[PDB]
Amino acid sequence: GPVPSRARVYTDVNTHRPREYWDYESHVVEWGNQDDYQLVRKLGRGKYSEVFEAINITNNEKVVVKILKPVKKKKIKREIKILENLRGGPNIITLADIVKDPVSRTPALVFEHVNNTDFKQLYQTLTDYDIRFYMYEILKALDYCHSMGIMHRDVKPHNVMIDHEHRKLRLIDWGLAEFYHPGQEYNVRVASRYFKGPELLVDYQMYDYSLDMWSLGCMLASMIFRKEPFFHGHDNYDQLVRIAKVLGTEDLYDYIDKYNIELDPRFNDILGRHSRKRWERFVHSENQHLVSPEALDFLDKLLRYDHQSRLTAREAMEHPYFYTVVKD
Ligand SMILES: COc1cc(/C=C/C(=O)O)ccc1O
Numbered sequence: 001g002p003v004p005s006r007a008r009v010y011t012d013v014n015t016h017r018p019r020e021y022w023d024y025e026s027h028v029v030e031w032g033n034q035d036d037y038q039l040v041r042k043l044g045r046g047k048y049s050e051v052f053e054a055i056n057i058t059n060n061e062k063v064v065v066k067i068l069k070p071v072k073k074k075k076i077k078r079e080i081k082i083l084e085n086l087r088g089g090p091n092i093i094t095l096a097d098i099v100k101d102p103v104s105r106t107p108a109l110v111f112e113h114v115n116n117t118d119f120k121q122l123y124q125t126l127t128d129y130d131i132r133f134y135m136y137e138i139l140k141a142l143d144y145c146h147s148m149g150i151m152h153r154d155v156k157p158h159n160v161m162i163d164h165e166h167r168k169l170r171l172i173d174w175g176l177a178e179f180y181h182p183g184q185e186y187n188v189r190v191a192s193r194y195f196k197g198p199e200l201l202v203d204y205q206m207y208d209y210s211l212d213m214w215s216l217g218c219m220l221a222s223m224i225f226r227k228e229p230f231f232h233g234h235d236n237y238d239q240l241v242r243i244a245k246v247l248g249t250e251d252l253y254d255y256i257d258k259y260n261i262e263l264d265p266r267f268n269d270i271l272g273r274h275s276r277k278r279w280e281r282f283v284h285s286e287n288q289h290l291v292s293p294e295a296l297d298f299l300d301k302l303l304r305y306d307h308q309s310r311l312t313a314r315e316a317m318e319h320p321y322f323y324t325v326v327k328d
Pocket residue numbers: 043051064066093111112113114115161172173174
């Protein structure tokens with residue numbers, strides 16, 4: 001059987017929290033007044049929800065309403081409880097209210113509005129300084145939720161809303177987030193393909209906060225190398241092959257051997273043998289102004305096969321890459 005694993009930090013946060021904190025199935029939802037919110041326009045539709053811009057008519061302020069699609073009451077309460085637990089934390093999207101939508105017959109989550117630039121165009125314009133700045137801001141959010149016993153499990157550009165005018169950032173869509181409990185096995189069908197950690201791709205279920213750090217590394221690679229997404233797999237199998245062509249196959253085998261994991265035999269014909277590459281090979285004249293020795297070392301320390309070897313969010317904030325970022 002597989003070798004067990006533990007987070008190297010915040011391991012027992014939920015253990016010593018009162019049960020009410022992590023037992024979301026028992027959570028009793030406090031409902032606001034649905035008539036306070038008037039929908040203005042549809043912003044997007046996902047697998048699990050529709051998202052609208054709206055107005056709070058009690059203060060005439062813009063808000064965002066997320067009307068959940070019919071899914072397990074467990075998952076609905078999970079997202080709600082996690083959002084309430086994390087409310088007020090650094091760069092955590094603020095849940096302002098919860099109402100019953102009369103048409104969908106489901107909960108509608110009301111969020112603070114973020115006046116964002118969509119990640120397609122913004123990533124085109126981010127400077128070296130901007131990338132360091134916003135990475136640091138994401139780390140504040142990740143160290144906070146990890147310190148609060150929660151892993152996000154869907155870190156990707158879409159879920160990092162940035163108001164570039166006020167240089168404000170919010171980590172959104174906590175619909176896949178979970179409470180970390182030592183020894184617990186989790187669903188590996190989380191995160192978007194390009195941001196899935198090697199643990200997910202090799203079906204290792206006893207993972208932890210460090211999953212988010214792989215995803216963050218994928219985002220960083222895409223920003224400093226100007227290639228979005230960086231690991232661009234055609235499916236979940238090809239995704240691991242794409243990673244192995246960069247990190248190499250010998251360290252992949254070291255990883256699965258450490259946890260006594262077996263690869264899907266379908267990899268036998270597609271994985272091949274690959275040396276580990278040096279990050280400098282991805283540098284060229286159109287991205288070099290975004291690359292520094294500090295950037296490459298930081299990236300290198302996020303993108304490890306072994307989830308136990310990755311920088312923690314707090315360790316990441318100590319990295320020399322962020323020395324040039326103004327703190328106040
Ligand atoms: C699309 O724009 C927004 C989305 C959200 C939240 C989304 C979620 O939590 O799923 C919050 C504020 C926004 O401005």
